[PDB]
Amino acid sequence: ITTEQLTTREVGGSGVFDALMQSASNHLLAEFKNNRITGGDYVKAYIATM
Amino acid sequence: MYYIEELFCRLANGVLNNTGIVTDDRGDIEDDSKPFIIVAANEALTRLHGRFNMRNNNVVVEMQEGRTNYPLLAKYAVQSYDPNEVKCPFIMDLAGEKFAEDVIRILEVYDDKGRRRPLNDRNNPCSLFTPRPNVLQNNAPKAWEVLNVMYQAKHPKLSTAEDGYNEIDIPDTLDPALDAYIAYRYYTSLNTPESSAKAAEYLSFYDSICREVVEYDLTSDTEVDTNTLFRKRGWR
Amino acid sequence: MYYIEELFCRLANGVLNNTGIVTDDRGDIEDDSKPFIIVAANEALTRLHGRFNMRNNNVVVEMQEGRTNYPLLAKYAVQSYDPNEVKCPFIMDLAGEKFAEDVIRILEVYDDKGRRRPLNDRNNPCSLFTPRPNVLQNNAPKAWEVLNVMYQAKHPKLSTAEDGYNEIDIPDTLDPALDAYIAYRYYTSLNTPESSAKAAEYLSFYDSICREVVEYDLTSDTEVDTNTLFRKRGWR
Amino acid sequence: MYYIEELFCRLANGVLNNTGIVTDDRGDIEDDSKPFIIVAANEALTRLHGRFNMRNNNVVVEMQEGRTNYPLLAKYAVQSYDPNEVKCPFIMDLAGEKFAEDVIRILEVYDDKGRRRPLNDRNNPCSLFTPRPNVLQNNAPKAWEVLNVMYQAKHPKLSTAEDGYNEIDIPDTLDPALDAYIAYRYYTSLNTPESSAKAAEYLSFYDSICREVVEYDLTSDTEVDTNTLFRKRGWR
Numbered sequence: 228i229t230t231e232q233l234t235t236r237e238v239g240g241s242g243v244f245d246a247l248m249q250s251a252s253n254h255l256l257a258e259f260k261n262n263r264i265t266g267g268d269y270v271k272a273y274i275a276t277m
Numbered sequence: 278m279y280y281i282e283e284l285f286c287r288l289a290n291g292v293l294n295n296t297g298i299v300t301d302d303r304g305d306i307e308d309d310s311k312p313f314i315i316v317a318a319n320e321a322l323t324r325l326h327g328r329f330n331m332r333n334n335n336v337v338v339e340m341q342e343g344r345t346n347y348p349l350l351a352k353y354a355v356q357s358y359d360p361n362e363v364k365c366p367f368i369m370d371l372a373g374e375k376f377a378e379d380v381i382r383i384l385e386v387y388d389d390k391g392r393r394r395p396l397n398d399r400n401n402p403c404s405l406f407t408p409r410p411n412v413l414q415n416n417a418p419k420a421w422e423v424l425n426v427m428y429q430a431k432h433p434k435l436s437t438a439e440d441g442y443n444e445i446d447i448p449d450t451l452d453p454a455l456d457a458y459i460a461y462r463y464y465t466s467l468n469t470p471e472s473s474a475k476a477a478e479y480l481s482f483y484d485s486i487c488r489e490v491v492e493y494d495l496t497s498d499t500e501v502d503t504n505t506l507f508r509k510r511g512w513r
Numbered sequence: 514m515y516y517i518e519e520l521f522c523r524l525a526n527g528v529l530n531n532t533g534i535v536t537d538d539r540g541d542i543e544d545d546s547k548p549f550i551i552v553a554a555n556e557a558l559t560r561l562h563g564r565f566n567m568r569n570n571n572v573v574v575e576m577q578e579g580r581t582n583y584p585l586l587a588k589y590a591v592q593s594y595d596p597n598e599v600k601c602p603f604i605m606d607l608a609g610e611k612f613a614e615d616v617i618r619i620l621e622v623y624d625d626k627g628r629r630r631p632l633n634d635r636n637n638p639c640s641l642f643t644p645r646p647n648v649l650q651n652n653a654p655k656a657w658e659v660l661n662v663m664y665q666a667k668h669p670k671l672s673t674a675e676d677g678y679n680e681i682d683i684p685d686t687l688d689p690a691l692d693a694y695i696a697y698r699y700y701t702s703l704n705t706p707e708s709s710a711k712a713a714e715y716l717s718f719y720d721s722i723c724r725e726v727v728e729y730d731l732t733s734d735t736e737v738d739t740n741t742l743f744r745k746r747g748w749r
Numbered sequence: 750m751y752y753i754e755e756l757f758c759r760l761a762n763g764v765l766n767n768t769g770i771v772t773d774d775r776g777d778i779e780d781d782s783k784p785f786i787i788v789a790a791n792e793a794l795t796r797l798h799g800r801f802n803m804r805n806n807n808v809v810v811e812m813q814e815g816r817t818n819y820p821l822l823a824k825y826a827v828q829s830y831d832p833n834e835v836k837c838p839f840i841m842d843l844a845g846e847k848f849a850e851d852v853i854r855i856l857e858v859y860d861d862k863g864r865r866r867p868l869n870d871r872n873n874p875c876s877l878f879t880p881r882p883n884v885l886q887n888n889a890p891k892a893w894e895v896l897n898v899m900y901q902a903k904h905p906k907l908s909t910a911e912d913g914y915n916e917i918d919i920p921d922t923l924d925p926a927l928d929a930y931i932a933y934r935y936y937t938s939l940n941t942p943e944s945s946a947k948a949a950e951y952l953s954f955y956d957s958i959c960r961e962v963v964e965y966d967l968t969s970d971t972e973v974d975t976n977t978l979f980r981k982r983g984w985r
Contacts, residue, residue: 526788527789707942729799730854731854738870738871738873739872741872
């Protein structure tokens, strides 16, 4: 086990931490395209789960 | 004047720049969400043309024997009447200038002989009456009597269809007011409390723009004329 | 008097330095968001030209028989018109800059004979009328009648496209107001409570600058002239 | 008068002493951050020269046949005109005193024969007009008519280039006002709420300094003159 597997410096990589970020972002973006949350509201919720 | 597509671009790169209803390139609104903007856009134009007397349009009405009420509807226009149920139209217009029922408030009426006709004068036997805002009533239709009605008119209703209108003709100083009202309608639709606070800001901004135009009179709303009562009163 | 390129550099090294809309070196704005600034820039310039009578321009209109409405549009000018659509343009700009379609409010109208034609005088038989703010109406076009219209003109529309207008001509004391208004639109579009508070401050700063200009009269907006009614009334 | 480098040192050892844009020795601002200060510095100087009538400069304009509008731009100066598109310049200046388009507001105009020329007097046929703040219009260009225009002038724009201006000429009592405005612009750029509160303090301090100067009249802004209407009115 290395620190690379835990997270990659690039966003959306193969890291476990990266996978959770992309998965959480996709769920929020699903409602973003449903016209129920603004862009500012979307990013605020994304940061709060970091 | 500009196409409705430019309005979509302006909204895409404007107040709605951070919304989920815009395209990935910020070039246009989502196609399925376009009718939402169109409904709001028509509503915004109606309010602007009410507070400000920007457009003054006139129509021609021909008196028909045996008829007293003359609704100002497109089904009675020569270019849009159905001969099956209408014996003959009495509203006259052109092929490229079809009547669009844009009547808001009647201002003055002149007959074919050039005499001003009083409106809603209950004590005047020859005066005309308006039982409804968009209905004109004449109590004595003559043989060759033709009436011209000059009224404050709204902007023609926009439509995404090809045959419908696809252009906007408003003073460019009111463009921020148009965008603010559309933004207010969109953010008010979302029921999140954060969007509610943002919605009120645009509505307040829209009202501020309208009063600024009135304050400086950028649309030539104020009108004056030379005094005529001095001669009529016999002051000499 | 500077080109549109300096505006991006000034904004990048100015109010919008902290935001991510600028390049890595803070020397220019991203191409993906350049039209966003252009829309705000056009909106800001219209507001300034409405509050202040900075620019005054005149046009020449040639009367054509059979036409009573003369819109002041670019497609009816002798330059930048389609010969296939309109057979004879009636707006002459043979010399100098082309007609930019920047009409806000009509001030006065003088004919070729050298007299003054009354405007929007309902009781005057020979007065002109304006059914729309940018449309001039004449009720009796003559054979060789030519009208000159003096109006308050806004800045021509800016565009980053090829062969567009890319020059800004405003008094240098109004530059902070331009930057404040553009920043106000950018921050208020983020729908963020932290950015919303910042956006309100810029709007107040923009209004503060404008009232400062009026207070000291840096634009020479006021105008006075020698009284002529003293002799007209026969006081002697 | 002092070099712009001294301004950088004063800011480095002044309001910006606790910022990340200064050198490790607190002797100068970071080179890549220098254009940010220059843009703010020019903006601050414009505001000071507007509220306070500190600099009064005059220019010489030569009337040219067939020309009525005379923009006050450097491209029409003898030391900076391009012969390719300009037949002959009409703004006269010296090699070491090149015209810098520092016009803010026109005060008075005198011809070569020593007669005062009224400005913006609509009822006076011989009066001059200014359709734009930096454009002078003469409706009757004579043969040898030469006009001198005295106007309130802004400080020349600073530039880091060697050929550009690198000196500041303002009353030393306004130096804290200059520093406060630059500090306000810098702290306003940062969007952190803590910096926002600090930014407002400098702006309020800048306004307080300006009113203090007005209160004590340290720049000799107030001006009076001996009464002349007593003789002209014929009181005797």
